[PDB]
Write an enzyme that holds these catalytic residues in place. Sequence first.
Site, PDB file in Angstrom:
ATOM      1  N   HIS A   1       1.288  -1.767  -7.943  1.00 20.35           N
ATOM      2  CA  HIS A   1       1.316  -1.233  -6.648  1.00 20.35           C
ATOM      3  C   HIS A   1       1.330  -2.508  -5.630  1.00 20.35           C
ATOM      4  CE1 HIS A   1      -2.793  -0.793  -8.236  1.00 20.35           C
ATOM      5  NE2 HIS A   1      -3.285  -1.326  -7.148  1.00 20.35           N
TER       6      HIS A   1
ATOM      7  N   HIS B   1      -4.420  -9.506  -1.830  1.00 20.37           N
ATOM      8  CA  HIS B   1      -3.209  -8.715  -2.190  1.00 20.37           C
ATOM      9  C   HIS B   1      -2.547  -8.544  -0.728  1.00 20.37           C
ATOM     10  CE1 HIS B   1      -5.906  -5.507  -1.306  1.00 20.37           C
ATOM     11  NE2 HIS B   1      -5.009  -5.004  -1.006  1.00 20.37           N
TER      12      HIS B   1
ATOM     13  N   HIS C   1       0.436  -6.160   1.411  1.00 24.47           N
ATOM     14  CA  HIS C   1       1.300  -4.755   1.576  1.00 24.47           C
ATOM     15  C   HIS C   1       2.401  -5.110   2.457  1.00 24.47           C
ATOM     16  CE1 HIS C   1      -2.180  -2.174   0.392  1.00 24.47           C
ATOM     17  NE2 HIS C   1      -2.721  -3.333   0.841  1.00 24.47           N
TER      18      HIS C   1
ATOM     19  N   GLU D   1      -0.338  -2.065   7.094  1.00 24.42           N
ATOM     20  CA  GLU D   1      -1.216  -0.703   7.169  1.00 24.42           C
ATOM     21  C   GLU D   1      -1.571  -0.583   8.382  1.00 24.42           C
ATOM     22  OE1 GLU D   1      -3.328  -0.996   3.370  1.00 24.42           O
ATOM     23  OE2 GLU D   1      -1.823   0.328   2.680  1.00 24.42           O
TER      24      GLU D   1
ATOM     25  N   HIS E   1      -4.956  -8.607   2.760  1.00 26.44           N
ATOM     26  CA  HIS E   1      -6.314  -7.967   2.719  1.00 26.44           C
ATOM     27  C   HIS E   1      -6.951  -8.853   1.612  1.00 26.44           C
ATOM     28  CE1 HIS E   1      -4.692  -3.946   3.622  1.00 26.44           C
ATOM     29  NE2 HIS E   1      -4.791  -4.649   4.522  1.00 26.44           N
TER      30      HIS E   1
ATOM     31  N   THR F   1      -7.323   1.426   1.252  1.00 19.04           N
ATOM     32  CA  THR F   1      -6.308   2.129   1.520  1.00 19.04           C
ATOM     33  C   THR F   1      -5.342   2.781   0.520  1.00 19.04           C
ATOM     34  OG1 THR F   1      -4.874   0.254   1.447  1.00 19.04           O
ATOM     35  CG2 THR F   1      -6.081   0.698   3.791  1.00 19.04           C
ATOM     36  N   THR F   2      -5.861   2.572  -0.697  1.00 14.13           N
ATOM     37  CA  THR F   2      -5.288   3.035  -1.911  1.00 14.13           C
ATOM     38  C   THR F   2      -6.309   3.982  -2.830  1.00 14.13           C
ATOM     39  OG1 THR F   2      -5.946   1.458  -3.682  1.00 14.13           O
ATOM     40  CG2 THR F   2      -4.138   1.012  -2.270  1.00 14.13           C
TER      41      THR F   2
HETATM   42  N1  LIG Z   1      -6.161  -1.876   0.559  1.00 15.09           N
HETATM   43  S1  LIG Z   1      -7.536  -2.348   0.229  1.00 15.09           S
HETATM   44  O1  LIG Z   1      -8.393  -1.115   0.836  1.00 15.09           O
HETATM   45  O2  LIG Z   1      -7.763  -3.859   0.485  1.00 15.09           O
HETATM   46  C1  LIG Z   1      -7.968  -2.403  -1.664  1.00 15.09           C
HETATM   47  C2  LIG Z   1      -9.093  -2.538  -1.654  1.00 15.09           C
HETATM   48  C3  LIG Z   1      -9.731  -2.638  -3.227  1.00 15.09           C
HETATM   49  C4  LIG Z   1      -8.571  -2.198  -4.197  1.00 15.09           C
HETATM   50  C5  LIG Z   1      -9.042  -1.929  -5.846  1.00 15.09           C
HETATM   51  O3  LIG Z   1      -9.645  -2.941  -5.944  1.00 15.09           O
HETATM   52  N2  LIG Z   1      -8.811  -0.830  -6.417  1.00 15.09           N
HETATM   53  C6  LIG Z   1      -8.116   0.355  -5.885  1.00 15.09           C
HETATM   54  C7  LIG Z   1      -6.582   0.294  -6.528  1.00 15.09           C
HETATM   55  C8  LIG Z   1      -6.833   0.052  -8.144  1.00 15.09           C
HETATM   56  C9  LIG Z   1      -5.891   0.451  -8.965  1.00 15.09           C
HETATM   57  C10 LIG Z   1      -5.757  -0.063 -10.146  1.00 15.09           C
HETATM   58  O4  LIG Z   1      -4.831   0.197 -11.341  1.00 15.09           O
HETATM   59  C11 LIG Z   1      -7.141  -0.705 -10.911  1.00 15.09           C
HETATM   60  O5  LIG Z   1      -6.780  -1.177 -12.025  1.00 15.09           O
HETATM   61  C12 LIG Z   1      -8.095  -0.834 -10.157  1.00 15.09           C
HETATM   62  C13 LIG Z   1      -8.021  -0.526  -8.696  1.00 15.09           C
HETATM   63  C14 LIG Z   1      -9.423  -0.741  -8.027  1.00 15.09           C
HETATM   64  C15 LIG Z   1     -10.499   0.123  -7.829  1.00 15.09           C
HETATM   65  C16 LIG Z   1     -10.264   1.286  -8.678  1.00 15.09           C
HETATM   66  C17 LIG Z   1     -11.198   2.274  -8.940  1.00 15.09           C
HETATM   67  C18 LIG Z   1     -12.351   2.272  -7.962  1.00 15.09           C
HETATM   68  C19 LIG Z   1     -12.348   1.391  -7.197  1.00 15.09           C
HETATM   69  C20 LIG Z   1     -11.385   0.269  -7.005  1.00 15.09           C
HETATM   70  C21 LIG Z   1      -7.310  -1.882  -3.919  1.00 15.09           C
HETATM   71  C22 LIG Z   1      -7.088  -1.891  -2.518  1.00 15.09           C
HETATM   72 ZN   LIG Z   2      -4.631  -3.722   0.680  1.00 15.44          ZN
END
Ligand SMILES: NS(=O)(=O)c1ccc(C(=O)N2CCc3cc(O)c(O)cc3[C@@H]2c2ccccc2)cc1
Ligand SMILES: [Zn+2]
Length: 257
Positions: free
Chosen positions: A61, A91, A93, A103, A116, A195-196
């Site tokens: 993603h 990372h 977006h 975003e 971010h 945001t994900t």
């Molecule tokens: N855009 S953002 O808000 O800055 C953001 C922040 C943290 C994270 C993150 O660390 N995540 C969410 C997405 C994700 C997807 C995966 O495949 C994975 O392996 C881990 C994550 C982690 C996460 C997973 C579960 C709970 C909390 C964070 C992603 C995006």
């Molecule tokens: Zn992000």
Amino acid sequence: HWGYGKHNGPEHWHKDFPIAKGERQSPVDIDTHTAKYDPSLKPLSVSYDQATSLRILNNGHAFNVEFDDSQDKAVLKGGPLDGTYRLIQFHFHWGSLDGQGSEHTVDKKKYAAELHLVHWNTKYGDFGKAVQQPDGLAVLGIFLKVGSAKPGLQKVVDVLDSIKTKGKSADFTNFDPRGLLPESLDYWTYPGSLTTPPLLECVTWIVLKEPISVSSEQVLKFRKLNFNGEGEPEELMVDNWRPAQPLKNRQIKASFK
Ligand SMILES: NS(=O)(=O)c1ccc(C(=O)N2CCc3cc(O)c(O)cc3[C@@H]2c2ccccc2)cc1
Ligand SMILES: [Zn+2]
């Protein structure tokens, strides 16, 4: 199975993650005229001198540049924050076109991309525990516009070929995130969420007013990455942004004016 496609994109997330329709979701539109200057906001402190990057990963993603956060090295403090937040990864977006990709929006304006820098509150011990807390994370957001190249971003742009598809990673040591910062640290701040998915409401968002400029060639390379894994039909990694969510009962505060 969430994603950014027509059948698993942001409008579908609420079925597996009901918090998608919660009270403090992110991103949001920043109405510059409504945001109020808060003189009580302490200056922001970005200490990345000792940052230790380790690897870059395409997770399906986005691509994350991960840091060693087992010690207090790269930390964010001050501003609206109480305590110390350690940098764990950054990372971006971005869009399929320069006219979209960020975003957060500013007066509804969408930027070509948004960086971010994710930090977790050391009082919670680790990232997994921090995401379960209302003040567990601090994410520093920086807008990208297309124009002149960003020297400090080129090292990231050149390694992307080695992590084209989901699941691929590459050594990425000695990268200095200070090279991705704008000149000014003026910012807007508000309480929100990841945001994900899982869209946890654990984030204090700090979004810089000053965008950084990247070149058309730099963002063009981002758009060559893939959402799919190797050996699967090619799905270009573009438009991996969630649109602005209802502000609800929240006030966005400005550190300036
Ligand atoms: N855009 S953002 O808000 O800055 C953001 C922040 C943290 C994270 C993150 O660390 N995540 C969410 C997405 C994700 C997807 C995966 O495949 C994975 O392996 C881990 C994550 C982690 C996460 C997973 C579960 C709970 C909390 C964070 C992603 C995006
Ligand atoms: Zn992000």
